[PDB]
Amino acid sequence: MENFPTEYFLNTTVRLLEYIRYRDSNYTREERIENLHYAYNKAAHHFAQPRQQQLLKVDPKRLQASLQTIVGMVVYSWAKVSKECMADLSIHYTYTLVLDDSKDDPYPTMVNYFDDLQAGREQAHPWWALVNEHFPNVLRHFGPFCSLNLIRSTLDFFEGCWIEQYNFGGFPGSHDYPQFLRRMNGLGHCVGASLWPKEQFNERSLFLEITSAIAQMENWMVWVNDLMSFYKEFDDERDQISLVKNYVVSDEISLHEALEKLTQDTLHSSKQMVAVFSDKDPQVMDTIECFMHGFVTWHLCDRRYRLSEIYEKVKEEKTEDAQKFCKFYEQAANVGAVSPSEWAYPPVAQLANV
Amino acid sequence: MENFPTEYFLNTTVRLLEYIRYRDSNYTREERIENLHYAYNKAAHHFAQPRQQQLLKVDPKRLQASLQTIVGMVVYSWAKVSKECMADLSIHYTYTLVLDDSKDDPYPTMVNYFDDLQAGREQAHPWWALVNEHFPNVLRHFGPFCSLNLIRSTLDFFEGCWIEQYNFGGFPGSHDYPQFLRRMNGLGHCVGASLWPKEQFNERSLFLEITSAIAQMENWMVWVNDLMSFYKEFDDERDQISLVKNYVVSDEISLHEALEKLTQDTLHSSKQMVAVFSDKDPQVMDTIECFMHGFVTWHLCDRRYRLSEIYEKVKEEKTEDAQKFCKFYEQAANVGAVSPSEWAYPPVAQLANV
Numbered sequence A, B: 001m002e003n004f005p006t007e008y009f010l011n012t013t014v015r016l017l018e019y020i021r022y023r024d025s026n027y028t029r030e031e032r033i034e035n036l037h038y039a040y041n042k043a044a045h046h047f048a049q050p051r052q053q054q055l056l057k058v059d060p061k062r063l064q065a066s067l068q069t070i071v072g073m074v075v076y077s078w079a080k081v082s083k084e085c086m087a088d089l090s091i092h093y094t095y096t097l098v099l100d101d102s103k104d105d106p107y108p109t110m111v112n113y114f115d116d117l118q119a120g121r122e123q124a125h126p127w128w129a130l131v132n133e134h135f136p137n138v139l140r141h142f143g144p145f146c147s148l149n150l151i152r153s154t155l156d157f158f159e160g161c162w163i164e165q166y167n168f169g170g171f172p173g174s175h176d177y178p179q180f181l182r183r184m185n186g187l188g189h190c191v192g193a194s195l196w197p198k199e200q201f202n203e204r205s206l207f208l209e210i211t212s213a214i215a216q217m218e219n220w221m222v223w224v225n226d227l228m229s230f231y232k233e234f235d236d237e238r239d240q241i242s243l244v245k246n247y248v249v250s251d252e253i254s255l256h257e258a259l260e261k262l263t264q265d266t267l268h269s270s271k272q273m274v275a276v277f278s279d280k281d282p283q284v285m286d287t288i289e290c291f292m293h294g295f296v297t298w299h300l301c302d303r304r305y306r307l308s309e310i311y312e313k314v315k316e317e318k319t320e321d322a323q324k325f326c327k328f329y330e331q332a333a334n335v336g337a338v339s340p341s342e343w344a345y346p347p348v349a350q351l352a353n354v
């Protein structure tokens, strides 16, 4: 495990993309930018308000980068929802991403969680205070069922962050620990259920397909995120408790074996996704198919994952996979690779100062 | 439905009880009775109040049956917690059992769930109205972390029963559906986290053990019920949607293969429980140990699972598994079979009229 498994990585990646039919969409670069700028503009103004500014403990530059990555993720994956929906989901997912910067023990602020909740008093933990206060803007876009899924997944997310403050990969032999923790901090049900705005879908008529998407998208989403993150986290000694690293510690297997597990689950997850929704309702298969492709595009385009480093390395190779990878990467860059100066302005800090 | 695989039911059950070495020595007969009555008495008085009598929509006979089934469960498996704790947990778990067999559409009363929650206004769904109002009586026994696990899991459970109203067992090929639904309706984190009252355990000193216990117990717990309750659910209309029968529909495999899959999972779950916690804090191991064996005694004795019927049929068969089954069924009866007339009195209905 000295060096990075570039060959293995390339094969698994090209396979993943072939399985999901990664291809070109009717989502034009011009539309991309209208959305990116719309979501960013509404969010930046939100996070620039004094209340948000004083209760949300985050370094200004990290908040700026966090918002930009999230807006990119939302706009590129929730392609079929409205501009307002992308904006509101962008705010919510930025809140969640930001919570990972807190090192503060939740205990003291969670001692009266239920009582304050039941009584209607503002939560003690400032994050819950801002988040529950803003939640209605996100929930108005969905039916009661989908809404409940968003509420629960976020609640799970809070506990996940809590557990992670312990930097615990699991007890050797605790095979059920890794995936339990990945579901906690994954936001699977939040993501999967937020793909169905009531304005475009009927929660009740499409109940079976919506529940199914949630169940399948949960695992596909987090595993693809783990896979595409495997490169940036490979030599990062700061990142110590990923799904893959916990598989090593908990299951007592080699990092390679852990990676093997992730690839098999991801590929299988991919096959079944298609095999199940291809014949189902077309509007649904469309939302699903666009999420998978955009999600992948976002990973390939965002610098956070540094996948450009892999492209640049295998750029001129005659191996089959290396080439397939580069074509895919170029496909992505074409619609995805966009300068931040084109939408992400002005910085949140400039708006907060005003 | 078709025909109960009595032959296999014995085969799987026997392997489990043999592997965990089923042996319940949690209480002396006098102790069991002492606890059963205390728990039943407080819950019975609670459920007989006019408000509870009015908002909880359940046929008196069913309420009484569920209560006795739950007091037994709590007392037989939470053998190390206090009497008060057992009583309050018995109330919470009776609220859930009632819903577990229920048939209703949550939709209309879940439209304003979040807004009413955040505002502190009483929920529209009567079940939530009662469960949330009584919850503090349950949470007062635990620290903030465990409390959060109880709240999330109860919330998950609600969604689970909702998804079940649709009688959907998964789209053939939707391999992630079965276990997704099971965790959703299993109350795994609720059960697992309620095993640690702050009066006996320090949530912060044993954060890693408790979290691990929650992750591992979730599956052991639910799978064991999936196997033990396979008989009472097999032909019940309300239980056709189950992990076993959903594995069949979703993974396109025979009932025979579904049961084999379930038992292998359970055996492995049992093996890791031992590997991980055997050499840990003895107080933790004791609680886990008492829960496991007591939980099995409960399934073997309680009316809800009608396992006496299986006994009264194979007690004659000279099969090896049928013999192994009856020995176990007898061993459990010697400790768990206890006449309701010794603790379950007076009936809730009689207290309601008073």
Ligand SMILES: [Mg+2]
Pocket (backbone or CB within 6 Å): B100, B185
């Ligand atoms: Mg159920």
Ligand SMILES: [Mg+2]
Pocket (backbone or CB within 6 Å): B100, B101, B239
């Ligand atoms: Mg049930």
Ligand SMILES: [Mg+2]
Pocket (backbone or CB within 6 Å): B225, B226, B227, B229, B230, B233, B242
């Ligand atoms: Mg069951």
